[PDB]
Structure 1
Amino acid sequence: LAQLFLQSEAAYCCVSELEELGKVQFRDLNPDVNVFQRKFVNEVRRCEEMDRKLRFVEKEIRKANIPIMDTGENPEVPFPRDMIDLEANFEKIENELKEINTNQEALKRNFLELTELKFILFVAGVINRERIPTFERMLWRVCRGNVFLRQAEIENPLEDPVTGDYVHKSVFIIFFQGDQLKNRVKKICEGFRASLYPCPETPQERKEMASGVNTRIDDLQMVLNQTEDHRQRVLQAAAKNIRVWFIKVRKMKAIYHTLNLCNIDVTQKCLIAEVWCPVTDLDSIQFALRRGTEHSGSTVPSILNRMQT
Structure 2
Amino acid sequence: LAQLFLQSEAAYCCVSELEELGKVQFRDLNPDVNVFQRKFVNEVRRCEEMDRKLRFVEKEIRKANIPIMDTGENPEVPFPRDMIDLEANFEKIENELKEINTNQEALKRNFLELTELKFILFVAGVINRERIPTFERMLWRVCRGNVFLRQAEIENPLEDPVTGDYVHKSVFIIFFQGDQLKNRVKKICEGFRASLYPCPETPQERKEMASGVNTRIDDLQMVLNQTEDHRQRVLQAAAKNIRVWFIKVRKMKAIYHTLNLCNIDVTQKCLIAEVWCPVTDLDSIQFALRRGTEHSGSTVPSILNRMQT
Query: What does 1:198-213 correspond to in 2, within 5 Å?
Result: 198-213=198-213
TM-aligned CA distance change 1:154 to 1:287, over 3 Å: same
Distance in 2, Cα, partners of 1:169 & 1:50:
46
- Secondary structure of the residue aligned to 1:151 is strand
Structure 1 residue 218 corresponds to structure 2 residue 218: yes
| Structure 1 contact 27–262 (Cα < 8 Å) conserved | yes
Q: CA deviation at 1:116?
A: 0.3
- Secondary structure of the residue aligned to 1:147 is coil
Deviations 1:47-93, CA, capped at 9 Å, x for gaps = 00001000100111001112232221111110111111111111111
Aligned length: 309
Identical pairs, percent: 100
Larger displacement relative to structure 2 (44-53 or 226-235): 226-235
| Structure 2 contact 5–272 (Cα < 8 Å) conserved | yes
Larger displacement relative to structure 2 (240-249 or 161-170): 161-170
TM-score by length of 2: 0.96
| Structure 1 contact 28–261 (Cα < 8 Å) conserved | yes
| Structure 1 contact 18–288 (Cα < 8 Å) conserved | yes
Q: CA deviation at 1:135?
A: 1.0
| Structure 1 contact 124–154 (Cα < 8 Å) conserved | no
Q: Where does the alignment leave 5 or more consecutive residues of structure 1 unmatched?
A: none
| Structure 1 contact 129–170 (Cα < 8 Å) conserved | yes
| Structure 1 contact 123–152 (Cα < 8 Å) conserved | no
Distance in 2, Cα, partners of 1:249 & 1:255:
10
Distance in 2, Cα, partners of 1:23 & 1:67:
32
Q: CA deviation at 1:123?
A: 6.6
Larger displacement relative to structure 2 (52-61 or 270-279): 270-279
Q: CA deviation at 1:183?
A: 1.5
- Secondary structure of the residue aligned to 2:166 is coil
Deviations 1:141-195, CA, capped at 9 Å, x for gaps = 1112211112122222122222233333221232222221121111111111111
| Structure 2 contact 152–172 (Cα < 8 Å) conserved | yes
- Secondary structure of the residue aligned to 1:127 is coil
Distance in 2, Cα, partners of 1:288 & 1:190:
74
| Structure 1 contact 117–214 (Cα < 8 Å) conserved | no
Q: Where does the alignment leave 5 or more consecutive residues of structure 2 unmatched?
A: none
| Structure 1 contact 126–169 (Cα < 8 Å) conserved | yes
| Structure 2 contact 139–145 (Cα < 8 Å) conserved | no
| Structure 2 contact 123–198 (Cα < 8 Å) conserved | no
- Secondary structure of the residue aligned to 1:4 is strand
Q: CA deviation at 1:23?
A: 0.9
- Secondary structure of the residue aligned to 1:126 is coil
Q: What is the Cα-based RMSD across aligned positions, in Å?
A: 1.4
| Structure 1 contact 130–193 (Cα < 8 Å) conserved | yes
| Structure 2 contact 122–149 (Cα < 8 Å) conserved | no
Deviations 1:251-308, CA, capped at 9 Å, x for gaps = 0101001010110111201110101123212111111110110111111111222100
Q: CA deviation at 1:122?
A: 12
Distance in 1, Cα, partners of 2:48 & 2:215:
47
Distance in 2, Cα, partners of 1:26 & 1:67:
36
